[PDB]
């Protein structure tokens, strides 16, 4: 067992501490977020304003002028880490009634699961996989057919192992947009 | 208003970030010490990891001559030794070389989180620091450059943040060392080791 072997093993210990730390983060921030979320819902167009105020190259860049008409009715956004593996992120979008989305799809939920295999096998690592989230577009308002922001909901990451815009966006929502929504909104004044 | 309620809540988030960082420190302190003991057995680990780290955050500030000094960097440590876990101490240790006198082989730079500075242009300046004295051997002082306007990496040690600028690249570098290079060092090293 070389020093090179020791280092790789110790790195596995760091991964476990990372998971322990996220567990603690989950306990800490869940009540704060729930409490924040029910105040934010009373602030008209809080989320499209915060998204617009967020760095455009992180999100705004992917949003059509038409995508923006849908997102104008985004009334709620939430991020969860609901699984025993705290690295899985669940992102929720809720829209008020509008001209584009059938009312079944006014609530859209997407789950990104940490993958052992994908993480194990540039090399800026891709770690996340997801299931296609179905959207019922109103006839005939389907922006999924430049590309629409809403195509992000079909991404799976199971086709290759490149770290793509969709996965990076998922992390931005979870680790930046969501914690900082209030700062971004206030920046907008 | 319901926007002044958001305010009160936002202060709770701020208390929680700090609580969370405090837990992080107790959690990782011994892991870093264990890791550091093994890394010291691995020659050139730090210059190899510095080199493999993203160039746009680090090696861009490193002239070839700087790099030559860094070939002799035998240890790098980051501490959060104070009450406020946002205070960072960054420690460089060098083996003997042509550039540093023996009492500058150990270089220590502390950054304090200043809430007054942080209260006052998107990732605004939050840290303050003291100049770290470096004793250079005769005619080896890399910070002494008039022409050749690009500052040696080593001018970073004199940054204080006590008088403010628009951006503070130096602070950005400090955070990168603390929050990216040091935690991801083994990952970076491994990328190089396995660029086969």
Residue numbers in the entry:
A (entry chain B): 19 to 139, 145 to 168, 174 to 217
B (entry chain A): 20 to 139, 145 to 220
Relevant lines from the article:
The PcVps75 dimer adopts a classic “head-phone” topology, which is characteristic of the NAP family. The PcVps75 protomer contains two major structural domains, a long α-helix at the N terminus (domain I, residues 18–58, colored green) and a α + β globular domain (domain II, residues 64–221, colored orange). An acidic disordered region (residues 224–250) at the C terminus is truncated owing to its flexibility. Two major histone-binding surfaces were identified for the PcVps75 dimer, including the disordered C-terminal tail and a highly negatively charged region that included residues E192, D193, E194, E195, E196, E203, and D204. Within α helix α7 of PcVps75, a highly negatively charged region that includes E192, D193, E194, E195, E196, E203, and D204 may mediate interactions with histones. Similar to many histone chaperones, PcVps75 contains a long, disordered tail of acidic amino acids that interacts with basic histones, leading to charge neutralization. However, the interaction between PcVps75∆C-K5 and histones is completely abolished. Finally, we revealed that helix α7, which is located within the highly acidic concave surface of PcVps75, and the CTAD domain are both necessary for PcVps75 to interact with histones. We also noticed that the PcVps75 dimer is much more stable in a homogeneous state than tetrameric Vps75 in vitro.
